Amino acid sequence: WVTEACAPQCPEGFDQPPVILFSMDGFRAEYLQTWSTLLPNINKLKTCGLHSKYMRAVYPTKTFPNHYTIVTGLYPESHGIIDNNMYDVYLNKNFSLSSVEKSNPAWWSGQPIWLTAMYQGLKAASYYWPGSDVAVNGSFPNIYRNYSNSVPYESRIATLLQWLDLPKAERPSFYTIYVEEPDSAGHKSGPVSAGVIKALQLVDDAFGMLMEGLKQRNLHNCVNIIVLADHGMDQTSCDRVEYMTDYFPEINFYMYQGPAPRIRTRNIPQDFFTFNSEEIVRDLSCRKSDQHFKPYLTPDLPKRLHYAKNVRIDKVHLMVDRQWLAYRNKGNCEGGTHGYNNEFKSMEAIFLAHGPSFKEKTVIEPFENIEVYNLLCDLLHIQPAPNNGSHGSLNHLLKAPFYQPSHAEELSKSAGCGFTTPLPKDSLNCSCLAQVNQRLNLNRGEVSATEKTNLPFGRPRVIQKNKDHCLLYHREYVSGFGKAMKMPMWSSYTVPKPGPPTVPDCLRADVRVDPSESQKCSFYLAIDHGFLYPPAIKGNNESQYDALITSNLVPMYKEFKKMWDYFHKVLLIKYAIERNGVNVVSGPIFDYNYDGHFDAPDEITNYVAGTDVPVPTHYFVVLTSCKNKTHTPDSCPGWLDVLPFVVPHRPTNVESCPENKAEDLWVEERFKAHIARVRDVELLTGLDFYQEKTQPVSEILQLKTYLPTF
Ligand SMILES: *[C@@H]1O[C@H](CO)[C@@H](O[C@@H]2O[C@H](CO)[C@@H](O)[C@H](O)[C@H]2NC(C)=O)[C@H](O)[C@H]1NC(C)=O
Ligand SMILES: *[C@@H]1O[C@H](CO)[C@@H](O[C@@H]2O[C@H](CO)[C@@H](O)[C@H](O)[C@H]2NC(C)=O)[C@H](O)[C@H]1NC(C)=O
Ligand SMILES: *[C@@H]1O[C@H](CO)[C@@H](O[C@@H]2O[C@H](CO)[C@@H](O)[C@H](O)[C@H]2NC(C)=O)[C@H](O)[C@H]1NC(C)=O
Ligand SMILES: *[C@@H]1O[C@H](CO)[C@@H](O)[C@H](O)[C@H]1NC(C)=O
Ligand SMILES: *[C@@H]1O[C@H](CO)[C@@H](O)[C@H](O)[C@H]1NC(C)=O
Ligand SMILES: [Ca+2]
Ligand SMILES: [Zn+2]
Ligand SMILES: [Zn+2]
C-alpha cells in the first residue's frame, strides 16, 4: 500500500462505503508539519487524501471532553463530560476514569454517532472511544470493547479487520479505533522529544497495518477513513508553575489543578451554591504584574469557548498562560500536558481523510471538531441529532455532498418607523442647545443608496418569533430598532478607507420612533448612554446629527464606554486602513442565563434604574471586508474576510488589569481575547447575516464558523 501510487471501488456486499474514525491521542498539528517525512504511512494519507492545516479542539483540550465532542457535535457544557475529573451536585457523585462512575450513563448526555447509526438501521462497532464502553441512553454499540490501555495496537487493528470480515447482516457500517500515543510520550518528555518521535512511528505502523489489511481485502479505496486527534501537546516545567499558597494565606477550597483549573468548596453538597465564587476570583485578580493565569467567573469567560452552561462547570475558573501550570501548593510538572486554551497553536489537533466520498489531494482551511458529527452523519447517510455544528460547513471536503444547506428563515418582519412629521411629539427630556430632521426623511433612491453601501450583504434577518422591530435609514448607516427593548438589535455601516470629534451636549428624540418605544435622556440621570454607531466616523458636522438621536442610544457602563470609545475612535480607523474600508455590524447581547443563546424578555435580570430598558451582558462588533484588498466591502464579488467580537459589558475593566496603563496597552488585547465566530454572534442575538451575498450557503457557513487567530 505505502509503495503504491495514489487512487466507490467497493467489493461484493459493500453497497455503501464503511466509515472508520481513527484517533491518535495528543497528535498535535505541529507533528504532521515537521515529522511527516519520518512517518511513511501517515505521509501517504497526507499526500493522496484530504487534510486540514489543523483541527480546533474544544475547551478544555482534554481526552474525554474532546473525544465525546467529536462523536456528538456538542460542546462539553451540553454533552456533560466537561473534564476527566468532575463532580455533580444533584447526583452527588464523583466522575473519574478509575471510578465505577465512568460507566454510569447519568453523566453522558446527547447522542453519539454510534447511537444515531443504530437508531437509523445501521450497525456500529467500537475498539475504544470514551463513551463506547458506557450504556449511553440505555444502549451500547453493536460490538464494543471495555477499555484496556495496554492491549497492543496490532491486536486492535486485527480485531477491527475481523469485524470487516463479518457477513453483510452482522457487519457494522461505522467503526471507531482509539490509540493512546503520541499523548503518553508527550506527557513524559514533552512535544519536541525522542520519545514522541518513537510514539509517532508506533502509530504510523498501527495505521500502516490497517491500510495494508484493507488493501488485502480490496477496501483501501472503499472505506472512508478519518484520522484525527482529540487535542495537541505543549511543554511543561516545574519552574513554570503558579501556586495558590502565594495568593491565599490559608486554602479551605478544593482545586482541580493543571492547565484548566476549577475551584469549588470542600464541603459538598451542602455549601456548593453558597460558596463565595466571586470572592475567590477577586482575591486572584491582578495580584502580580507577571501573573501567569487569569481568574474568571464562568459567565465572564470568552463566549467562543462555550464553557459555562453546566452545573459540573464550577463558577471559579483560571485561564492559564502558554506552557504554565496552576497547583494548590508545592508538591508531575515535567515533560508536557494539554488542557489549555484551544486557540493556542500547541493545542491544535490533526485531521486527515481518505475514501471515495472525500476529495483527493486537497488541503482544506482549519475547522472545529464540533463539525465532525454532521460530516459522519453525511457519510453514513443518516439524519443528525440536534448538535452545535453547522450542517453544510464541511461540504467542501466531500466529492458529492449528502446535505444541501439553506439560509435561516426570518420569523419577524419589519414594520412602522416611517417619517411623518419633522417635529418631535415628545422631547424625551433630551437637549441640544446648538428642520435638521429632514435628513432622516430618505426617498426610494436615497434608501437604495444607503442599502447598497451600508448593507452590501443584505440586512441581518430576525430569527425570533413576535420580535417587534423596524428598520431606520440614514445617509451613513442603517439600523434595526428593537421596539420592546427601546434600542437597536443591530447597526450596519461601511467605513471607507481613511486618508473629527463627536458633537458634545447634543441629543434629541427620533421623529420616526414612537415616544413609548424610545429611550429618554432622563433615564440615565436617575451606567450612562452610549452610541452604537459612532457619530463622528462618517461625513461632517451635519452628518453627525443623524446619529445624535435616541434610537442610536444603548446602556453603557463608564468603564466599558472607555474601551468602546477607544475602539471606534482609534482601533476601527486602523482596521479600515489595513482592509481598504470595513463594514461594521454592532449591537447588544442579552445572555443572563449564560446558555450562549439570545435571552427571552423574562430571562433579563438587569435593567436601567426604574425603567424597562434592559442592560446588555455583551456587545458585538462584526467587521466584514473583502479578501481581495483592491475592492471595498460595499463593492466586491469574491470571498469576504471577517473579524467578529463579543466583548462583555462589565462595570469594571478588572479583566485587563489596566491600573496606571494607557488605553493603547490593554483595549486592543481585551477585544482580541473576546474574538468569536459569526455563528456565536448569531446564536447570542437571534440574527442571521450575509443572506443577500451571491455565494452558496455551504461557502457562507465556512465564513460563519471561521475563527480569526493572531
Ligand atoms: C464490559 O464489562 C462489563 C462489566 O464491567 C460487562 O458487563 C456484564 O455483562 C454480563 C453479560 O452476560 C452481565 O451478566 C453482567 O451483569 C454485566 N455487568 C455489568 C456490571 O454491567 C460487559 O459485558 C463487558 N463488555 C464486553 C464487550 O466485554
Ligand atoms: C467527591 O470527592 C471529594 C474530594 O475530591 C469529596 O469531598 C470531601 O467531602 C467531605 C464532605 O462530604 C468534606 O468534609 C471533605 O473536606 C471533602 N474533601 C475534599 C478534599 O474536598 C466528596 O465527599 C466526594 N463525594 C463522593 C460522593 O464520592
Ligand atoms: C448546542 O446544542 C445543544 C443541543 O441542540 C443545545 O442544547 C439544548 O438547548 C435547549 C435550549 O436551552 C434545551 O432545551 C435542550 O435540552 C438542550 N439540549 C441538550 C442536549 O443539552 C445547546 O444550547 C447548543 N449550544 C449552543 C451554544 O448553541
Ligand atoms: C434515547 O433513546 C430513545 C429510544 O429508546 C430515543 O427515542 C431518544 O431520542 C434517545 N435520546 C437521545 C438523547 O439520544
Ligand atoms: C483582485 O482583483 C483584481 C481586479 O480588481 C484582479 O486583477 C486580481 O487578480 C484579484 N486578486 C486575486 C488574488 O484574485
Ligand atoms: Ca441566554
Ligand atoms: Zn487525549
Ligand atoms: Zn494526555
Explain this structure to me?
Belongs to the nucleotide pyrophosphatase/phosphodiesterase family. The active site is at residue 63. Residues 1-710 are extracellular. This protein is of the alpha/beta class. Among the domains are: 241-337, 2-Layer Sandwich (Gyrase A, domain 2), CATH 3.30.1360; 437-705, Extracellular Endonuclease, subunit A (Extracellular Endonuclease, Chain A, 3-Layer(aba) Sandwich). It is 22% helix and 18% strand. It has 16 helices and 30 strands. The strands form nine sheets. Strands 7-6-8-1-9-18-2-19 form an eight-stranded mixed β-sheet. It has a six-stranded antiparallel β-sheet with strand order 22-23-24-27-28-29, sandwiched between helices. α6 runs parallel beside α8 (194-216) and α7 (183-189) packs antiparallel against α8. The structure holds a molecule of 2 linked components (NAG-NAG) (3 copies), 2-acetamido-2-deoxy-beta-D-glucopyranose (2 copies), calcium ion (CA) and zinc ion (2 copies). Calcium ion binds at residues 591, 593, 595, 597, 599, 603.
